[PDB]
Copies of this chain bind each other. A is one copy, B any other.
Amino acid sequence: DLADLFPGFGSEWINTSSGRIFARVGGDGPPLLLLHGFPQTHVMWHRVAPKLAERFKVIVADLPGYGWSDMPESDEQHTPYTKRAMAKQLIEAMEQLGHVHFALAGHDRGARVSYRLALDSPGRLSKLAVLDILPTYEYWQRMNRAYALKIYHWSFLAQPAPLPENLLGGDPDFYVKAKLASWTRAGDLSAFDPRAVEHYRIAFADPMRRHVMCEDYRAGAYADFEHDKIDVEAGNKIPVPMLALWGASGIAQSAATPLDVWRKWASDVQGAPIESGHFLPEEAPDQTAEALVRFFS
């Protein structure tokens, strides 16, 4: 029932100290790690990874706790699902492949892992691409009526268990599809490959998977914010050359482009809007792929 959307990619279960990371691996050349976000899995890269795999060893991983990666036991502080912890786990996973210095592109939650990784261990990264995020700190700092309605799920999923878990169980299929549709330029699922939607839907149908996503968001409200706040206050910038791509209808320039935001977080950032909703690699795969290839090569 689950299509293989990365023909010619191998499938690796990468052991780490916190559990297995699942990854599709293809290509040859410099290693490039691609991290999806919510509510998706690695298959969201299915339209762009083949193009990346022309020039790179492309590692398309499920985030810890997402997709087919193992789900580490969480704790009161949601530690394993803090971006610091997920970055540490993915660094460990890349080390199991002998990749200690790699390029990194993350979308959504994966991009939050990615810039936290860049902040915590910039020596691991040759280049960083983040797709359609601002740092978690920025979202919370920007919090106002408009953002609270737009990213209500940041506060909804951060509610204490089991409130979101129980509500999500009310109609998980609807919810994951609603999230997918509502953040696209189209407003429907037509930008997505149906077989990828089935990947997302099946992952979301697992209550334990949904709980992990809530743990991720709870981290996003608490530890991840605090971690970012320390960096803002210390003036710590990302020293890795980075590319920030955003959907022109994701979250753009009401009073500051993402580029102006990322410049405060990174010393070397280039940016471009992509004609897309949130799901750049699926809504605008050619435009995301060429931007990524141009940047990483």
Interface residues of A in 218-234 (CB under 8 A from B): 221, 225
- Chain B residues with CB below 8 A from A168, complex form: 167, 170
By the criterion CB–CB under 8 Å, are B140 and A145 in contact? yes
**A152: CB under 8 A from chain B?**
yes
Most buried by B among A145, A156, A159: A145
By the criterion CB–CB under 8 Å, are B156 and A221 in contact? no
Contact indicator per residue, chain A 132-153, by CB within 8 Å of chain B (1) or not (0): 0000000011011100110010
Within 8 Å by CB of A154, from B141, B148, B159, lies B148
- A229 to B, closest residue via Cβ: B145
By the criterion CB–CB under 8 Å, are A145 and B221 in contact? yes
Q: Number of contact residues on A: which range applies? A: 20 to 34
Contact indicator per residue, chain A 100-129, by CB within 8 Å of chain B (1) or not (0): 000000000000000000000000000000
From known contacts A170-B166, A171-B167, A174-B166, infer whether A152 and B156 are also in contact, taking CB-CB under 8 Å.
yes
Within 8 Å by CB of A149, from B145, B158, B170, B174, lies B158
**A178: CB under 8 A from chain B?**
yes
**A155: CB under 8 A from chain B?**
yes
Shortest CB-to-CB span from A254 to chain B, Å, is 14
Shortest CB-to-CB span from A163 to chain B, Å, is 6
From known contacts A171-B170, A178-B163, infer whether A141 and B152 are also in contact, taking CB-CB under 8 Å.
no
**A72: CB under 8 A from chain B?**
no
- Chain B residues with CB below 8 A from A140, complex form: 144-145, 148
13 residue pairs bridging A and B, Cβ less than 8 Å apart? A145-B225, A148-B154, A148-B155, A149-B158, A149-B159, A152-B155, A155-B156, A163-B174, A166-B175, A167-B174, A169-B170, A169-B171, A170-B170
Given A152-B159, A155-B155, 5 more pairs with CB closer than 8 A: A141-B145, A166-B171, A167-B168, A167-B170, A169-B170
Closest 3 CB pairs of A and B: A170-B170, A152-B155, A140-B145
